[model samples]
Target: KVEKEIKTNQDIDVVMTIFSDPAFTIPQIFPGIASIKCIEPEIFEAEGKFLAFSYKVKGRVYKGVDEVRIIYDSDRGNGILYIRKKDNNTLQIILEHDNKLTAFLGKPYVSSNLDRLAENIDEIIRLERIKRKI
Candidate 1:
């Protein structure tokens, strides 16, 4: 129930400093994902539906247009989207705990994927800040 950590360093309009920016692993941990798995951002103003953040998935390749996020359930310690949990096509690291891939991808390795994604992004922002005095 805690979702207010954003701070304005230089004074701006809602500096929502949250790591919901995993624009890398969005497609990787997708359903039936195997080879090319990755991440979008655009549009604004909707019933939680932001047109700019249109995402894509492969393998089974579930294509989508909008993701209206209106919940704030803190499953763990991260800001992960709570996806539909079911048999075979269970939620991955970014969604839930129990996972399945051997029956599809060959092994279990999605948590690592997430770690890599956020880690790199963090550095870039940090480094970028240093360059611009952020």
Candidate 2:
């Protein structure tokens, strides 16, 4: 159960709008994702719970099934992005079969990826604001 949160200057609605299209929108904002193909083009609506997609990186491919949720406190002008695996059964199988290989070797990599995503999100938001002004 690895979780990460990032605080952004952008409002919840702005962030939500970007993430709501995880398949197309994420690759636009998150670096290192060379491309993404939607196996299930379920847009991340406020009422939705799951997003399934596959992405490519460095000539390798990976599948991602993520469960989406949000925590927004409009009064404070703050929002958090919560990410987690969609299937407990799949997680269990990976844990059992990989023998903590991901836990040992993949922890740092995951954290770095999350950080890069956050940074890219911030940059995109800033750029959007600039574009609007122009």
Candidate 3:
């Protein structure tokens, strides 16, 4: 029911870290996510602006998603990553729970205990010093 997009000039790895990190990927803090599979053989397009990938889940299949595109404008120094729901039914279910769609609905908080899991990622990354020079 709600759709939003975030634009960023930060490195893809940094932006991805916000979502793909352990807390988000494993034991998903949000309810909609059944599981995520980061496709192997990573691929990119549109001068590295567009990206395509697949992931398996209970309500959606990896095949349903043709491409998870990331469009970048080097001139503007920013990028737009796009993801579409596989279908209306899936979208409906994903939005069924407020906690699952909190970000889209603009809620202040949900499951503060689970939310705290996010706090560790940046520090973990910082301590590891995982640097990718884009």
Per-model lDDT: 0.28, 0.38, 0.30
Q: Write the per-residue lDDT of candidate 3 for residues 83-104, one digit (tens) a residue.
A: 3333321211111221332333
Error of 3 at 70 (Å): 13
| Model 2 C-alpha RMSD to native | 14.1
Top TM-score prediction, candidate number: 2
Regions more than 4 Å wrong, model 2: 24-33, 43-99, 126-134
RMSD to the hidden true structure, all candidates: 14.1, 14.1, 15.1
Residue 122 of model 1, lDDT score:
46
Q: What local lDDT score does residue 67 receive in model 2, on the 0 to 100 scale?
A: 36
TM-score of 3: 0.26
Model 3 score (lDDT): 0.30
Q: Write the per-residue lDDT of candidate 2 for residues 1-134, one digit (tens) a residue.
A: 33445556666444544444455343442323444544544422221111232223211112234434433221112233334342321111010112253234434544565566555656776676576552
User: TM-scores of the models, in the given order?
Assistant: 0.27, 0.42, 0.26
Better of 2 and 3 by TM-score: 2
**Model 2: lowest-lDDT 10 consecutive positions:** 89-98
